[PDB]
Amino acid sequence: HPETLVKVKDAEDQLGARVGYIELDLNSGKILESFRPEERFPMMSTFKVLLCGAVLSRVDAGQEQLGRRIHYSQNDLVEYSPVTEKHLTDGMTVRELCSAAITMSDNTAANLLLTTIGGPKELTAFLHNMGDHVTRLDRWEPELNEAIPNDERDTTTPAAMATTLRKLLTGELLTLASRQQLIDWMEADKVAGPLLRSALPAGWFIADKSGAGERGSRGIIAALGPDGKPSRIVVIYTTGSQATMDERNRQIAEIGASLIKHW
């Protein structure tokens, strides 16, 4: 809806920064609204959904098992590792690692999972092979959040991310079980409270993944809809703003409010 694009424009003005936006019909794959669809933004932690998509593909092919246990040490632990810091002694299963990476945005969990697939280069190769030749992951946590202006490392476009997410959640790539698991992890998101969720009416479904990084970078990818079922994908990114986390949160929630209003 036009007024949602006005809200996005409002956000650019008030943040003093670029905002990218896509609203995509989940079933038909038709783009309903867009803003800067072909411009690059740092993915930040939103890449963690793509990461577990690649892990689940390996699980489907038998190259990975969700119950496989990984042990690691104190020195593997990077900044913001709320789950992995608690399991030095017992290790974590692959399933637990993806849960930590998606629902809590655990950074060490993401690095361990990256190691299982062969690193950022192999995540990018995974994306390439499912038809996304735009999105690229280049670094590990936490350096991938650096968001140097015009640096194309660790970036996506709103259009590429939105269509890739649709393929992962509802396309032919993954088994039904793996699709359900990926969206289940996203529904269980615990660190995106002040974002789209804050605009979400009672009874609506949402499955999402937030991101935050340096230089004002903030974003969210989501499947959401009324009557307890997702029916649209929403992607929102911004980078470059000097604004507080709180203002950036409120802008994204406000775009969300408009999206919902004009559903």
UniProtKB/Swiss-Prot annotation:
Its EC number is 3.5.2.6. It is an enzyme of class 3 (hydrolase). The keyword Acetylation does not apply. SUPFAM superfamilies: beta-lactamase/transpeptidase-like. GO terms for molecular function: beta-lactamase activity. InterPro entries: Beta-lactam/transpept-like, Beta-lactam_cat, Beta-lactam_class-A, Beta-lactam_class-A_AS. It comes from the Bacteria. It holds the Pfam family Beta-lactamase2. Disulfide bonds join 52-98. NCBIfam families: bla_class_A (NF033103), blaTEM (NF000531). The beta-lactamase present on pBR322 was cloned from plasmid R1 (R7268). The class A beta-lactamase family has a specific amino-acid numbering system, sometimes called Ambler or ABL numbering and often misspelt as Amber. A multiple sequence alignment was used to derive a consensus sequence and then the consensus was numbered taking into account insertions and deletions. This allows use of identical numbers, e.g. for active site residues, despite differences in protein length. UniProt always uses natural numbering of residues, hence there appear to be differences in numbering between this entry and some papers. TEM-type are the most prevalent beta-lactamases in enterobacteria; they hydrolyze the beta-lactam bond in susceptible beta-lactam antibiotics, thus conferring resistance to penicillins and cephalosporins. TEM-3 and TEM-4 are capable of hydrolyzing cefotaxime and ceftazidime. TEM-5 is capable of hydrolyzing ceftazidime. TEM-6 is capable of hydrolyzing ceftazidime and aztreonam. TEM-8/CAZ-2, TEM-16/CAZ-7 and TEM-24/CAZ-6 are markedly active against ceftazidime. IRT-4 shows resistance to beta-lactamase inhibitors. This is Beta-lactamase TEM. The gene is bla.
